Amino acid sequence: FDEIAPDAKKVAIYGKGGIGKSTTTQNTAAALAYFFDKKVMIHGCDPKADSTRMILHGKPQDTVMDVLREEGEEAVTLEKVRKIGFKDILCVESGGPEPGVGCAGRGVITAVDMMRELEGYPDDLDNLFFDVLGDVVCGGFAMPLRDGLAQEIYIVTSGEMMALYAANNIAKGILKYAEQSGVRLGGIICNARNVDGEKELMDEFCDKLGTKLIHYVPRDNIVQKAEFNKMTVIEFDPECNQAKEYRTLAKNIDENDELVKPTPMTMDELEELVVK
Amino acid sequence: SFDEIAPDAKKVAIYGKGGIGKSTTTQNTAAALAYFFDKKVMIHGCDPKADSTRMILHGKPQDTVMDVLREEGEEAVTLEKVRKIGFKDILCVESGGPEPGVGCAGRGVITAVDMMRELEGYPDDLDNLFFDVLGDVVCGGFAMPLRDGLAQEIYIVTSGEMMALYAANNIAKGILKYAEQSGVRLGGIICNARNVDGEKELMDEFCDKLGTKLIHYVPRDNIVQKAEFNKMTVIEFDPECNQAKEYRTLAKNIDENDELVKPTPMTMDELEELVVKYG
Ligand SMILES: Nc1ncnc2c1ncn2[C@@H]1O[C@H](COP(=O)(O)OP(=O)(O)O)[C@@H](O)[C@H]1O
Numbered sequence: 112f113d114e115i116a117p118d119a120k121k122v123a124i125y126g127k128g129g130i131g132k133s134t135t136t137q138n139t140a141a142a143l144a145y146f147f148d149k150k151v152m153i154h155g156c157d158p159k160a161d162s163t164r165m166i167l168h169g170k171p172q173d174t175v176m177d178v179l180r181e182e183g184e185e186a187v188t189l190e191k192v193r194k195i196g197f198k199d200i201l202c203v204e205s206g207g208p209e210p211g212v213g214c215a216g217r218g219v220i221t222a223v224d225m226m227r228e229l230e231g232y233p234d235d236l237d238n239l240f241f242d243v244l245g246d247v248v249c250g251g252f253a254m255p256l257r258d259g260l261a262q263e264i265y266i267v268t269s270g271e272m273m274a275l276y277a278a279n280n281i282a283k284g285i286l287k288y289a290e291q292s293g294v295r296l297g298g299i300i301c302n303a304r305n306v307d308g309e310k311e312l313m314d315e316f317c318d319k320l321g322t323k324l325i326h327y328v329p330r331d332n333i334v335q336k337a338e339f340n341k342m343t344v345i346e347f348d349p350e351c352n353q354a355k356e357y358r359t360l361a362k363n364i365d366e367n368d369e370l371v372k373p374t375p376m377t378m379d380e381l382e383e384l385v386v387k
Numbered sequence: 388s389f390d391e392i393a394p395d396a397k398k399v400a401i402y403g404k405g406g407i408g409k410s411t412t413t414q415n416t417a418a419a420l421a422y423f424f425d426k427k428v429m430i431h432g433c434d435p436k437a438d439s440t441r442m443i444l445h446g447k448p449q450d451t452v453m454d455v456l457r458e459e460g461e462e463a464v465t466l467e468k469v470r471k472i473g474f475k476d477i478l479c480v481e482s483g484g485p486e487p488g489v490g491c492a493g494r495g496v497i498t499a500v501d502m503m504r505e506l507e508g509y510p511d512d513l514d515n516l517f518f519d520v521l522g523d524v525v526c527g528g529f530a531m532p533l534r535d536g537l538a539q540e541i542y543i544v545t546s547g548e549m550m551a552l553y554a555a556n557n558i559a560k561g562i563l564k565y566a567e568q569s570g571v572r573l574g575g576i577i578c579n580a581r582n583v584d585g586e587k588e589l590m591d592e593f594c595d596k597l598g599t600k601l602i603h604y605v606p607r608d609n610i611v612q613k614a615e616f617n618k619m620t621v622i623e624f625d626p627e628c629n630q631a632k633e634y635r636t637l638a639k640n641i642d643e644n645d646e647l648v649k650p651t652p653m654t655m656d657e658l659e660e661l662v663v664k665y666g
């Protein structure tokens with residue numbers, strides 16, 4: 112597993128559904144490519160299949176599962192599943208079986224295994240991102256931790272109880288495979304929802320987890336404005352304040368050395384924190 | 388058999404995105420069926436959060452079937468330890484699940500349902516049986532109520548949020564998959580509102596396009612948190628407040644529902660176009 116892009120920083124973004132992982136992952140990769148001239152690649156490990164939409168310009172990426180299901184195994188080619196977007200950013204979408212068919216994470220197992228057999232992860236890569244579903248940590252969604260695809264893990268979360276609960280469960284999964292695959296929690300990204308005391312709550316949450324608040328991403332309308340124009344915030348307006356926020360986060364992730372084993376909290380501890 | 392499980396009872400399953408209000412809606416719905424309509428109700432929590440029967444038992448989360456199995460053992464688990472009575476004699480069971488990363492998150496649901504069949508935990512004299520299921524992913528134990536046909540009527544809790552409607556649309560796809568196989572159907576859509584203008588209108592069009600009906604528009608009320616701090620469900624805390632009357636209306640609409648349908652899920656373009664139209 113160490114042969115996959117050895118000179119690249121392999122990162123995986125986890126979090127609750129709709130908490131802002133696809134938005135953070137895309138804008139961070141765009142900032143690394145546009146501002147720091149880094150060769151980046153995004154591998155969408157979310158069954159929603161829209162983790163690479165704004166980098167590909169409002170062009171939903173045919174998932175690996177979609178191509179494999181209709182066309183066949185021999186028909187899966189790097190040119191078809193792996194498309195190029197903004198600042199030569201490589202994009203791949205795992206997808207998944209239709210709801211109820213089978214394991215939701217299966218799509219991640221097949222796409223990662225096929226990407227290895229097809230050599231879709233260039234050696235000259237600088238950064239590789241895995242946008243993974245964090246509502247459940249199991250099967251294909253737990254593969255980046257179990258198999259050690261990404262060594263640095265970052266969990267996007269907001270102030271709401273459910274977002275922190277999912278983040279705490281992801282920390283439990285990281286601890287489970289920390290010694291087994293050398294996976295570690297880089298930091299916690301806070302996709303804020305403009306609430307007073309949220310920034311203070313996250314500081315105590317990260318302190319109790321034994322990690323750091325890598326960045327406080329504010330809620331900005333420019334994200335929607337850029338989305339409605341089939342683009343990312345960096346590509347739409349790299350001079351706006353939100354673009355400078357993603358640039359700071361991109362630099363912090365790529366220059367992060369404080370990788371730690373988290374100390375998850377009990378339900379009572381987490382409940383006592385949200386009320387405070 | 389599956390149909391043998393409480394034959395004279397209405398078997399319902401509540402699905403939806405995480406933190407959308409499935410546990411709150413299910414508990415208050417069951418409390419209104421037991422208090423206002425004198426029905427014998429039971430709740431089976433199929434969510435790994437393990438707090439689907441918290442307010443019915445009053446405050447403290449219930450020991451899950453997986454927890455008692457992971458600590459005591461297979462023979463040491465009894466119907467008394469896993470099924471506990473709460474407000475208005477409502478029976479409560481919590482499936483739980485494995486520790487994050489260990490294995491299939493839904494495995495706790497299979498183990499608890501099979502163990503409940505063997506221990507005969509579903510009384511025959513039941514009137515209503517609810518399953519609070521995780522809807523972020525429709526697979527494994529979370530898809531069992533659809534696949535095995537534990538519940539014939541399914542209700543999805545959702546709001547105007549894009550992700551909430553996306554999860555609801557995926558649940559509809561899963562219902563359609565097992566509709567012919569196990570006779571499972573979509574009863575309706577419950578809207579746990581977030582007090583936004585045009586949200587009701589959005590839900591009316593969402594249900595129209597899905598080929599179903601908006602069973603009820605549950606408003607966002609602070610009395611829910613107030614009742615939660617007093618270790619109680621809204622019905623038990625103040626059955627005369629407006630929110631209690633809203634849950635009472637929903638409870639009778641579900642119990643008196645016949646319009647069970649095979650949904651017509653929407654494409655991603657159709658769903659975005661709808662969210663952009665109103666929002
Ligand atoms: N920093 C932000 N500011 C404003 N809106 C955001 C931000 N991040 C995400 N969003 C919005 O939140 C919604 C969900 O974002 P998304 O990244 O797709 O969540 P996820 O990938 O975790 O499911 C989108 O409509 C997006 O526009």
Ligand SMILES: Nc1ncnc2c1ncn2[C@@H]1O[C@H](COP(=O)(O)OP(=O)(O)O)[C@@H](O)[C@H]1O
Nearest residue numbers: 405406407408409410411412605606607608611
């Ligand atoms: N009708 C409502 N009005 C106000 N708050 C609500 C309502 N329904 C749910 N909530 C709140 O939303 C949060 C999540 O509710 P919950 O039922 O646990 O979601 P789920 O079971 O789907 O994860 C809780 O803090 C609860 O107080």
Ligand code: SF4
Nearest residue numbers: 214250491492526527
């Ligand atoms: S391992 Fe996870 S994604 Fe796979 S069937 Fe089980 S709960 Fe679903």
Ligand SMILES: [Mg+2]
Nearest residue numbers: 133159161162
């Ligand atoms: Mg996404």
Ligand SMILES: [Mg+2]
Nearest residue numbers: 409410434439
């Ligand atoms: Mg619940």
